[PDB]
A paper describes a structure:
The murine monoclonal OKT9 was among the first antibodies shown to recognize hTfR1 in several cell lines and have its activity explored in a variety of contexts. We now demonstrate that OKT9 is a potential blocker of cell entry by clade B NWMs, as it engages an epitope on the apical domain of hTfR1 that is a shared binding site for clade B NWM glycoproteins. With nanomolar affinity for hTfR1, the OKT9 antigen binding fragment (OKT9-Fab) sterically blocks clade B NWM-GP1s and reduces infectivity of an attenuated strain of Junin virus. Knowledge that OKT9 blocks the GP1-TfR1 interaction through steric occlusion presents a mechanistic platform for the development of broadly active competitive inhibitors of NWHF that target viral entry mediated by hTfR1.
A crystal structure of OKT9-Fab was determined to 2.0-Å resolution by microfocal X-ray diffraction. The molecule crystallized with space group P21212 with a single molecule in the asymmetric unit. Sequences for the variable light and heavy chains, determined by sequencing of their genomic loci from the OKT9 hybridoma cell line, were used as guides during model building and data refinement. The overall structure of OKT9-Fab resembles a canonical murine IgG1 variable region. All three complementary determining regions (CDRs) in the heavy and light chains were resolved. Their sequences were identified as CDRL1 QSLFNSANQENY (27-38), CDRL2 WAS, CDRL3 QNDYSYPLT, CDRH1 GYTFTNYY, CDRH2 IYPGDGNT (51-58), and CDRH3 ARDNSGYVGFPY (97-108). The constant heavy-chain region spanning from A136 to T139 showed poor density that precluded building during refinement and remained unbuilt in the final structure. Of greatest relevance was missing density for residue Y103 in CDR 3 of the heavy chain. Its side chain could not be placed during refinement and was omitted from our deposited structure but was included in subsequent computational analyses. Averaging across four biolayer cycles produced an equilibrium dissociation constant of 4.8 nM for the interaction between OKT9-Fab and hTfR1.
Numbering used by the authors:
A (entry chain H): 1 to 101, 103 to 135, 140 to 219
B (entry chain L): 1 to 219
The structure:
Amino acid sequence: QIQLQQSGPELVKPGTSMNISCKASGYTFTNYYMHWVRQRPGQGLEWIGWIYPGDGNTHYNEKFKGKTTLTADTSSITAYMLLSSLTSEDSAVYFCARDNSYVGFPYWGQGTLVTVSAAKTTPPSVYPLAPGSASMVTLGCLVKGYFPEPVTVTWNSGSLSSGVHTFPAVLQSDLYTLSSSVTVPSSTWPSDTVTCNVAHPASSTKVDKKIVPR
Amino acid sequence: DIVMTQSPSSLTVTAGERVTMSCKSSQSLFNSANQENYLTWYQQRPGQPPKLLIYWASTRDSGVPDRFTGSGSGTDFTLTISSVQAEDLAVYYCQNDYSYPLTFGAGTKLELKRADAAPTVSIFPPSSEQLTSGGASVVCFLNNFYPKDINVKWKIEGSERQNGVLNSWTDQDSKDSTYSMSSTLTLTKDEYERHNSYTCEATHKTSTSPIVKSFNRNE
């Protein structure tokens, strides 16, 4: 039951500093190294460094040593990484990863998406996609005009997962627009309720839009 | 810097066939003292953290199927999947775990090959909530097709519209290996109500005739 739970996505301005967390549960926090890995959008993985929470010992990749500080708090079994003097190149997903006594990283956090931008945080407008009035039927939700990434879309709070397609967002108008598709038996709609659950964690916004017929 | 070179950049294979991807290190990862190769393989599905596949170049981690096999020594390493499943679609990374800094390869993207499939097309008018926004989005879903290449044309009363259209493809489906794409035509409320008939045309290699879905404002 190892769990590395990282802090939520954050929008930070260029030249500022950002602290991200990784709460490590299910094991002795002071007996294992905690590594950090960066993955820029669409790019590969880069190793940042590690910390040994048992004594504060650290070792950094020289590429990140100038602007990265790793700390750990044993009382709260939480590891921290301070990224300072952030640039647009630093926009990436940051993972925390625990190693094992073999080599490699068997346990990973979910990753924290950091967007370095001067734009403002904008929650999305969620619009229902219902078929025009004129076997099975496809519905959808339009998640338009948000910043920054990401958003999560579920249907009926996870019940409708088969036949669900969520399309990657595209950046236009300095904002992201995303759509998600769901196809259910035609006998179940509008007989039963179909609802999209949109969450924009960088804005702490959640929307539950019910798809009603026209 | 130990540079890790992975080849090829991407694979394409039919379900059930065998693939082998290569990882080469600019310096030896072989420890002559204990006769071990400090080489690790990872599998990363879209939107998820990397998952540990094989360590010590050839030792599989707990719960990894036996179809995954790592081989090689020194500077030449391979990852073999004896019978690729639809769920095996991912980017596979090798990692130097021998000397600092720890370094990863650029990854090898495993894509799947399957029978051609025509898309299912659905068109959706702007919602009444978005019409109060002063904007109007016309969305067209093209679900579960193969191959990935597909064309979408928008028509407003029979006249083609070029820009204002944004398309987005899903990742390959992890169980049926199909693709889906969305096409969104965004206009202002005034320009949308200036017209009546909106048409989304999908032309895929599975047919010489386009699949055409239409919506009229006065339906």
